Amino acid sequence: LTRPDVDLVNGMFYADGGAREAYRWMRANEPVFRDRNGLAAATTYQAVLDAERNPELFSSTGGIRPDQPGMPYMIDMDDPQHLLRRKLVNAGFTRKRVMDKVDSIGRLCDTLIDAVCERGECDFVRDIAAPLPMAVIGDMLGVLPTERDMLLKWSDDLVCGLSSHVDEAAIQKLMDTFAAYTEFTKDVITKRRAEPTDDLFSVLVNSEVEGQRMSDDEIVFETLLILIGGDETTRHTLSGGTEQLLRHRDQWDALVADVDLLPGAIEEMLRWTSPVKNMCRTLTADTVFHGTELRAGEKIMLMFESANFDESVFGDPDNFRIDRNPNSHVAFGFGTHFCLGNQLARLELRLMTERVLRRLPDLRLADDAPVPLRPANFVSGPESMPVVFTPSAPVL
Ligand code: HEM
Ligand SMILES: CC(C)CCC[C@@H](C)[C@H]1CC[C@H]2[C@@H]3CCC4=CC(=O)CC[C@]4(C)[C@H]3CC[C@]12C
């Protein structure tokens, strides 16, 4: 009944377990809510949809983070500049193009499962959920296999860096990692200019925008956006979604018995886990929006998890149900910026989860205590997830 006392920039808010109670208050009392620091947030599904649908008023050019300015990548652009970038990269992410990767991604899943299946135990986050989407996007970008862990470590350092709650040495670590990624990329530019390859790095390196070559700085940021979209999102729906399947044994069992129930289960895993907790928009004019007066130039946080637990839309959002149908979640956002990777992510989720179901059919949590979550304010999910299963033989 009492107003939440919350800093939406504090990663602890997303990790401590209180967020969904706080969102319930917000959606009932103050749909466009201001936190203890005055930062506006769209908290109801309608408020998020309406802002998404009006980019003239709710611009992306001010930067998607609450505490950082506009940067040279497509997520911080409005149309028509944004669509020009999308047209450079869309072809590699369509459903048809993604479906061409069924065998290739399936082999990565079997490799990873081969690595643990004889042991009867693993850390589902470290051994399964994190590496698979890293390998997929790394192959798309032309990362050598032996370079995947290094890029993944950098990607972790960049997004774990995101909180008002971390010390100024965690801030230098953030900037040092970015500088590392920048020098790596500027060397990739040298290489793909001289020796172009088939992959997404090379396409960005050699791409044109406004009839001049894409800026080296925009190449840094666009490739970074694709990498992190790739390697810091799906991992959390794989681990947090599988957690919920383990906690609802009857649903796990239904899937083991009937793989045709999988597509629906994935949509519920997405809704439940909502890996991307928010994205900002900047007001281009003073307005009144769902009864909150908003000032030109301030940001508003689109709260996707809050929208995804909106009772007026889902009826019973607090039950996890693989049979939820339809499942109109906005884990991937909505509108012109609607997730580029969303078919890639769904196919990663399908192919891995099917192999886990088939090959580790008595999977369980090592203990049913809460799974620890990353206290960061942008992307977050399970930090680790020890699991156990009856050992079995490798397949590849
Ligand atoms: C479960 C996995 C994922 C989730 C929950 C997720 C979520 C999101 C969300 C919320 C946005 C912003 C949408 C908006 O503001 O309306 C977005 C944008 C984006 N995503 Fe994803 N994403 C995931 C996977 C991926 C993958 C695998 C990639 C590519 C490797 C990726 C690439 C991008 C890009 C490039 C954008 C910016 C698109 C644009 O501005 O037009 N995402 N995603
Ligand atoms: C999950 C995806 C859809 C979105 C991924 C967006 C990623 C690439 C964004 C989010 C926060 C961004 C960082 C914010 C802090 C920052 C300030 C700088 O002065 C250099 C660039 C960095 C180091 C930014 C690099 C790009 C990051 C890491």
Side-chain angles (χ1 to χ4, degrees), residues 2-55 57-164 169-172 174-182 184-209 211 213-294 296-310 312-396:
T2 300
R3 191 194 188 77
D5 168 25
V6 301
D7 171 1
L8 294 180
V9 186
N10 189 329
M12 287 176 289
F13 175 73
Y14 303 93
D16 71 10
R20 290 175 182 171
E21 177 171 18
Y23 296 153
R24 182 164 325 103
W25 187 94
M26 293 174 198
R27 292 186 304 265
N29 286 265
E30 197 176 294
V32 171
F33 170 81
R34 294 194 181 271
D35 74 1
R36 88 194 167 207
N37 303 311
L39 172 64
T43 71
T44 54
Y45 189 105
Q46 185 71 44
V48 166
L49 231 55
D50 284 348
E52 296 278 34
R53 284 179 311 143
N54 192 357
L57 177 48
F58 295 95
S59 168
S60 288
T61 65
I64 50 150
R65 297 325 290 137
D67 61 339
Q68 300 286 348
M71 287 157 193
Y73 50 17
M74 75 184 77
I75 206 171
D76 273 6
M77 298 174 184
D78 293 337
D79 290 334
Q81 290 80 26
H82 157 262
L83 213 65
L84 275 43
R85 276 57 182 190
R86 282 291 299 240
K87 277 173 179 186
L88 289 178
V89 296
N90 275 337
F93 293 91
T94 67
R95 193 169 174 101
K96 285 188 171 160
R97 183 73 180 272
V98 161
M99 279 317 159
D100 282 343
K101 316 175 198 289
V102 163
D103 297 326
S104 173
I105 295 167
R107 297 172 173 276
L108 289 172
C109 294
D110 280 315
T111 297
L112 287 168
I113 295 165
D114 293 356
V116 300
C117 63
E118 283 155 356
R119 313 202 296 101
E121 72 185 8
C122 71
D123 173 353
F124 194 86
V125 168
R126 187 193 56 200
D127 297 329
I128 299 289
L132 180 279
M134 185 59 230
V136 166
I137 198 68
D139 283 2
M140 295 175 58
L141 287 155
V143 179
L144 268 175
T146 51
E147 210 141 51
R148 293 166 177 166
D149 297 358
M150 176 193 80
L151 283 178
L152 187 49
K153 177 184 200 301
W154 289 349
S155 303
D156 291 349
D157 290 341
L158 287 161
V159 298
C160 293
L162 306 173
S163 181
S164 55
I171 287 191
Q172 267 304 312
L174 176 57
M175 299 301 303
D176 291 339
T177 298
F178 185 67
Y181 179 78
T182 300
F184 176 90
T185 301
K186 286 181 174 171
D187 201 46
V188 172
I189 293 163
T190 297
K191 295 167 195 331
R192 302 315 163 67
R193 294 284 166 71
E195 179 182 51
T197 55
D198 75 34
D199 57 47
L200 264 172
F201 258 135
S202 199
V203 164
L204 281 171
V205 167
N206 292 122
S207 76
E208 287 181 13
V209 280
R213 199 141 59 181
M214 186 179 277
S215 149
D216 303 343
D217 289 343
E218 176 170 2
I219 292 161
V220 171
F221 277 92
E222 296 287 18
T223 59
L224 191 57
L225 172 53
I226 287 155
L227 180 61
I228 303 285
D231 75 8
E232 292 298 350
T233 49
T234 308
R235 68 194 282 169
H236 298 312
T237 303
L238 281 174
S239 52
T242 298
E243 182 200 350
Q244 294 307 311
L245 305 175
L246 297 176
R247 293 190 182 279
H248 299 85
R249 211 75 203 178
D250 55 307
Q251 298 181 46
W252 177 262
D253 287 339
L255 286 156
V256 174
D258 189 0
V259 76
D260 290 339
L261 298 174
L262 192 44
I266 292 310
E267 300 299 311
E268 191 70 334
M269 295 161 74
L270 282 163
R271 182 185 76 83
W272 193 266
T273 56
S274 295
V276 174
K277 303 303 178 187
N278 50 72
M279 284 280 178
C280 290
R281 293 295 180 272
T282 302
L283 283 294
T284 55
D286 286 350
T287 194
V288 173
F289 181 68
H290 284 82
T292 290
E293 302 161 34
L294 295 174
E298 82 175 304
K299 292 187 164 163
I300 185 166
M301 300 258 279
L302 301 181
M303 308 293 296
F304 301 113
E305 196 173 349
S306 184
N308 276 347
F309 284 71
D310 189 320
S312 64
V313 173
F314 298 96
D316 63 330
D318 291 322
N319 295 141
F320 176 89
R321 302 198 278 110
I322 58 163
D323 65 354
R324 188 170 301 275
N325 189 16
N327 188 346
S328 305
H329 68 75
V330 284
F332 290 125
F334 193 83
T336 205
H337 294 280
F338 185 69
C339 176
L340 175 62
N342 76 97
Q343 295 293 310
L344 188 65
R346 283 166 159 130
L347 178 61
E348 290 172 344
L349 281 167
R350 179 171 87 79
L351 295 181
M352 184 53 88
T353 301
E354 186 280 339
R355 290 168 175 72
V356 171
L357 284 160
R358 177 189 88 242
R359 289 182 65 185
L360 323 178
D362 61 346
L363 197 63
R364 32 180 183 289
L365 297 166
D367 104 305
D368 56 7
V371 169
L373 304 177
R374 190 75 207 179
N377 69 24
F378 184 48
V379 288
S380 176
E383 295 188 356
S384 60
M385 197 171 93
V387 293
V388 304
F389 48 91
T390 301
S392 64
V395 307
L396 277 191

